[PDB]
Amino acid sequence: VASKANDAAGDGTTTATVLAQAIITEGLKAVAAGMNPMDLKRGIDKAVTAAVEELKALSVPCSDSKAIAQVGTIS
Amino acid sequence: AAKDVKFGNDARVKMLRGVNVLADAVKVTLGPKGRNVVLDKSFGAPTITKDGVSVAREIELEDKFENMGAQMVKEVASKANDAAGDGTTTATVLAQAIITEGLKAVAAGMNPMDLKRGIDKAVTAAVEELKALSVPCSDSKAIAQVGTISANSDETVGKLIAEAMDKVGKEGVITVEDGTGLQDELDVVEGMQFDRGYLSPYFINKPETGAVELESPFILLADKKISNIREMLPVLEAVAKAGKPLLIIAEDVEGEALATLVVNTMRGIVKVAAVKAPGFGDRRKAMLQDIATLTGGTVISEEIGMELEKATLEDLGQAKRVVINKDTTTIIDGVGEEAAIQGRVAQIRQQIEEATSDYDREKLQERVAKLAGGVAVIKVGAATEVEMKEKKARVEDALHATRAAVEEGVVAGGGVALIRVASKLADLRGQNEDQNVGIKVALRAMEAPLRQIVLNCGEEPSVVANTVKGGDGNYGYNAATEEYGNMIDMGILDPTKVTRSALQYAASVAGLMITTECMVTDLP
Amino acid sequence: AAKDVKFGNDARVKMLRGVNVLADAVKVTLGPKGRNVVLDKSFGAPTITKDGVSVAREIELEDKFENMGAQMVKEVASKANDAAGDGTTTATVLAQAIITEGLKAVAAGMNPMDLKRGIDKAVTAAVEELKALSVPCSDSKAIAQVGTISANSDETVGKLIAEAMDKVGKEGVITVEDGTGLQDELDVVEGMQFDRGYLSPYFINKPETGAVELESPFILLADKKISNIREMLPVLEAVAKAGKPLLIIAEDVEGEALATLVVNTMRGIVKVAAVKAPGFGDRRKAMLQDIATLTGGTVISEEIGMELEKATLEDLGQAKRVVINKDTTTIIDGVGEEAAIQGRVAQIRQQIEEATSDYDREKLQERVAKLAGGVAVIKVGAATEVEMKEKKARVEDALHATRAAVEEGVVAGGGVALIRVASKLADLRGQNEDQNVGIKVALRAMEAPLRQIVLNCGEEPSVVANTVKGGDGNYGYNAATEEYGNMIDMGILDPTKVTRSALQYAASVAGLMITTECMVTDLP
Numbered sequence A: 001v002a003s004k005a006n007d008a009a010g011d012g013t014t015t016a017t018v019l020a021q022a023i024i025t026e027g028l029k030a031v032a033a034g035m036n037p038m039d040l041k042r043g044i045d046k047a048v049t050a051a052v053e054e055l056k057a058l059s060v061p062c063s064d065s066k067a068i069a070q071v072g073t074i075s
Numbered sequence B, C: 001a002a003k004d005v006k007f008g009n010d011a012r013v014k015m016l017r018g019v020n021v022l023a024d025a026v027k028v029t030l031g032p033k034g035r036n037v038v039l040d041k042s043f044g045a046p047t048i049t050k051d052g053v054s055v056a057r058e059i060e061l062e063d064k065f066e067n068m069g070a071q072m073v074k075e076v077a078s079k080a081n082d083a084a085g086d087g088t089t090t091a092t093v094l095a096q097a098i099i100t101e102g103l104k105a106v107a108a109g110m111n112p113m114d115l116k117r118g119i120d121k122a123v124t125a126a127v128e129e130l131k132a133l134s135v136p137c138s139d140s141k142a143i144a145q146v147g148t149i150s151a152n153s154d155e156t157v158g159k160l161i162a163e164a165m166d167k168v169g170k171e172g173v174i175t176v177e178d179g180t181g182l183q184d185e186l187d188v189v190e191g192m193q194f195d196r197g198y199l200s201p202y203f204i205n206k207p208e209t210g211a212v213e214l215e216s217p218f219i220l221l222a223d224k225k226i227s228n229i230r231e232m233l234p235v236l237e238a239v240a241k242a243g244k245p246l247l248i249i250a251e252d253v254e255g256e257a258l259a260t261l262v263v264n265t266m267r268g269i270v271k272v273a274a275v276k277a278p279g280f281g282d283r284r285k286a287m288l289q290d291i292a293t294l295t296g297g298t299v300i301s302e303e304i305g306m307e308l309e310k311a312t313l314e315d316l317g318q319a320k321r322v323v324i325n326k327d328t329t330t331i332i333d334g335v336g337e338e339a340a341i342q343g344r345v346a347q348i349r350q351q352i353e354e355a356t357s358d359y360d361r362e363k364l365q366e367r368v369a370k371l372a373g374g375v376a377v378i379k380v381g382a383a384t385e386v387e388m389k390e391k392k393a394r395v396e397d398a399l400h401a402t403r404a405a406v407e408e409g410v411v412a413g414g415g416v417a418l419i420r421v422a423s424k425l426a427d428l429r430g431q432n433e434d435q436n437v438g439i440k441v442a443l444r445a446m447e448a449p450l451r452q453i454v455l456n457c458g459e460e461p462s463v464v465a466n467t468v469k470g471g472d473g474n475y476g477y478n479a480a481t482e483e484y485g486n487m488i489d490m491g492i493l494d495p496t497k498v499t500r501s502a503l504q505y506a507a508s509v510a511g512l513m514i515t516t517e518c519m520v521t522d523l524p
Ligand SMILES: Nc1ncnc2c1ncn2[C@@H]1O[C@H](COP(=O)(O)OP(=O)(O)O)[C@@H](O)[C@H]1O
Pocket: A011, A012, A013, A014, A015, A016, A074, A075
């Protein structure tokens, strides 16, 4: 995850890693509760396809020099 | 003594294994078709047994901790039996079922406090459901019914119990003695029982019952706390040369004279036993005087000046028998004059005229009850001595289940009742998703006994379980004959008390463990 | 005996682990929703408990050093309880909090002596803040209030305490006895209590209280130091054949006769106990004569010629009860004549006319007080014996918290008070940057109890902590019901004495450790 995140945008690799550790922790806990892992997956994926649409909706264009300097700086 | 302390997970894992060894050894004996456990015995040949209570008693593990696990379940499952008359194994079997699944849950990273809540709810709910499934046992017909079944199809055992209850009441005290002829006998006789047990296990002279049986002994009725053995020497030397046992009823008996009387009996000259007096404070005064009257004995009150050093046989009470156990003393046939016992009744009955409180009226009534009410004795008749003390044993078994059947009724016996109540509350929810798991753990635990009976029989559990669940009420599987039917009709029943007690007691120790964070014990 | 010596860091690391095992085992039980600790017991089934005092008592480690750590915290937390009535656990939990964080600091290379200064300031300041947060408890209404809450919503317990204090004063001696009926009783009776404890723990006959309870014993009032057991043989043989206990009050009792009386009771014939006389020098003369008068006994002064070999029962005093603990003796109902006790009062009252010093006047007054002031006894009534000695226990609990509430008032009980005082002094500075760390270590240690209560309940600590901080005064979280509110209104309160004591005591041992450079012990 950490690696692909990087080939993709060259940033957010830590975030990615943090999310994965988190999906895994929680998911495995639910597998121990006796849930069906293939469904836990389908749920996770549905949740995500939805999240991505949500993000594309929150996204506002970054086009002025100030905004660009801001992403640069934060990075 | 330096201790070994274990925390959280370690603590609980040790506990789990401890309990598993207990349960795995004890559970294989559950059905009507249990497997054998071989129990070594220092001298001579080993013991082959299918009796869970016997197996349990032997379980003690090397790993302290692991041991503590096992000993904990043992303790509580024995209490189940203490209060119900059975279930020791069932309780253990269920105890494992919750502990296993709950304990996995905590270890997976769910909340212990919630898991307990869920289990506890699931139990509360099932206990209710049990009351609903429960078929009453109230009339003489029903009494004799559960008696006969509980005594293994023997219709005459059912009869004798029904008759005893028919004579002294469902509450009245019924005891069992060895029979003198081939004929059964039922006699009612002046006597009494009170909720007070032996002061030392070393008083037990019938190891198989965990009980003290004393043959027509003298009874000492002191009123002080017997601490010194000195007060005894006159009375303990008269009842020595009289070649008879001696029962002591007083405030208490402190080590100084207790530990002496203990070693004095367990391989020693005068064989005796002592128990605390019934009641406390202002009650015990008259409550002890009642037993005096009943046994024609004299009460040695310090508040009058008399001491135990100033006492002879003429002061001691007398009764043709007396049995003590863990927590009950019952005296049988008191030599106290009829003119006296009926006289005391007249005194107390009058005293009820006071009616200053519904507590005082009811408390004086309980006293009239014990005294004039009497004790019903069953003498078990048989052809041979082997048959005799065997039939005698089943009569005691049946009496147990019947007293229990009266109180809370009976239900499907094969595990069935538990399987049933569980499939009923299969929507049950909590608030935490963690409490759900709690409820489910508990629910699925309730299938354990049936699944185990079936397994022991060499049949498929899942298959029998599923079809028992498919039904309703007391429809079940009779592992003995492999037919489905109405378990009660088929004569496979447990008193409600016992199935409940088993469950509640299993649940208690499981919750306790699921919430244990620390464990302290001695160094290996 | 060759020793093993550890220095500086080694020494402290060992100490830390020692304390951590103590605290980690004891702390899991803190809340109204504690977890269980399983405590093995040689024979029989283990003990499951949520009682930190019980857990602590068992903790002793193999690694000496590590053990010394644990034992040190144990000592000091028990003193907290000694002086306040509670907090044993809380003290431990806070003790860890400081020790952990302070001890990291020292190891990081900061100055121990400053770290102590900072902690000690933070504490001094918080103790003040506590006095400010404190709500008084003075009138009968307030007494009964904290009583009832401290006795678990039982309004009748609050009443009886309020009534007792209403009879013999907020100072007056109040004891608790087993009840004879169903009714509570409150009687005032001639007696006395003085700050002097048993000479040997082996005198304890009630292991659960760590106390000596003797039933209407004779009282020996010697005036010399009892060293030889020879002086005893006449009196110790009369009180043997009298079948009664015996209390000894004299200068002291030296091993020669102490160690003999010790083994003479712990599994032996005459069961007795002895304590030192109250006061020293010229005071003890009359101070002992007071007890004589009160018990109608004779004082055996060597300065008169009488010896203990020249003493019979007629010389011994008498009282219907007497309880001794670690450091208190209180005698209940002395048989001394009214004409005598009132006579002695008249003698002493007159003697106050002297008024040569505000020390002599006040000292003769304390004597009049004990003698004519009397002792108020509560008899706890109940329906069953189990209920009885249970209710009796909560009455003693409540009495404890009430005596403490009177002295220093009450505050928010959920850890809350501590969390509060901490968020108040959150600017506090020292001079060393090292002293700051000291203050901060201490401040943040004050959140430990709340954080822990919350944790034991399975809720988030940080979140509950933050919102308790967000409020004012006695706003807090009630872990039992999970509602925020006014802790005092909601009936969750600690006497101010106990919260303070706990804090101060934890702070003492923490600083002691942070300033420890060497540790000497025996070789493994
Ligand atoms: N001032 C700040 N306060 C809160 N979040 C910040 C701040 N500055 C940067 N971040 C966030 O921290 C995240 C960290 O980026 P970084 O540490 O490089 O993780 P990654 O490798 O996943 O990019 C970014 O997602 C950004 O949103």
